[PDB]
Amino acid sequence: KVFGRCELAAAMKRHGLDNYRGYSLGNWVCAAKFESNFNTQATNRNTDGSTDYGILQINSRWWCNDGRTPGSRNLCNIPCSALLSSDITASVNCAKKIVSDGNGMNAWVAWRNRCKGTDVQAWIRGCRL
Ligand SMILES: [Cl-]
Ligand SMILES: [Cl-]
Ligand SMILES: [Cl-]
Ligand SMILES: [Cl-]
Ligand SMILES: [Cl-]
Ligand SMILES: [Cl-]
Ligand SMILES: [Cl-]
Ligand code: NA
């Protein structure tokens, strides 16, 4: 599913991401825009052989099982395919574990490089929330 900007802001809010670990909803929308262009089916292979999955490009090295990432963990206890659903629940619940891990949203290199310190409230401007 390719979300609209306000549609995804609403869905993330309904699933409890607004101000989760102190990160305002615009941070999460911005991170999704640059990780996936709001496409739940986004995948990207890393040079180390791990794969990133879904709207927040969550990596198989630590967070999900795809059966092809040797020596990896599955800390969200989900198949990586769950992260590609039209239903964002699995992605949101796994993102809450990642952002709690110690480095906050810096876990997402596109957030650090493209969202951090910018006017992220622009990403939710206009939306009925
Ligand atoms: Cl947009
Ligand atoms: Cl915001
Ligand atoms: Cl594996
Ligand atoms: Cl594990
Ligand atoms: Cl699995
Ligand atoms: Cl959803
Ligand atoms: Cl933090
Ligand atoms: Na894994």
3-state secondary structure of 10: helix
Is 85 inside any structural domain? Answer: yes
SS (H, E, C) 28-87: HHHHHHHHHCCECCCEEECCCCCEEECCCCEECCCCCECCCCCCCCCCCCCEHHHHHCCC
Dist. CA 94 → ligand 4 center (Å): 13
Q: What is the resolution of this structure in A?
A: 1.5
Dist. CA 19 → ligand 2 center (Å): 8
Does residue 56 contact residue 89 with C-beta atoms inside 8 Å? Answer: no
Q: Which ligand is nearest to the CA of 115?
A: 2
User: Is 112 exposed, middle or buried, given 0-12, 13-18 or 19+ CB atoms closer than 10 A?
Assistant: middle
Residue 58, domain extent: 5-124
User: Is 67 exposed, middle or buried, given 0-12, 13-18 or 19+ CB atoms closer than 10 A?
Assistant: exposed
Which residues, including other chains, have CB under 8 Å from residue 80's CB and lie 6 or more apart? 51, 53, 58, 60, 64, 65, 66
3-state secondary structure of 100: coil
Is 53 inside any structural domain? Answer: yes
- The CA-based angle 69-74-78, given to 5 degrees, is 110
What does the block give as tokens for 97? 């574990």
Dist. CA 11 → ligand 5 center (Å): 25
Does residue 57 contact residue 42 with C-beta atoms inside 8 Å? Answer: yes
Could you tell me the CATH number of the domain that includes residue 37? Answer: 1.10.530.10
Is 101 annotated among the ligand-binding residues?
yes
Does residue 98 contact residue 28 with C-beta atoms inside 8 Å? Answer: no
* Residues annotated as part of the active site: 35, 52
The total number of structural domains that make up the chain: 1
Does residue 69 contact residue 50 with C-beta atoms inside 8 Å? Answer: yes
Q: Which ligand is nearest to the CA of 15?
A: 6
Cross-sheet strand order for the sheet of 43-45: 43-45, 51-53, 58-59
Is 40 inside any structural domain? Answer: yes
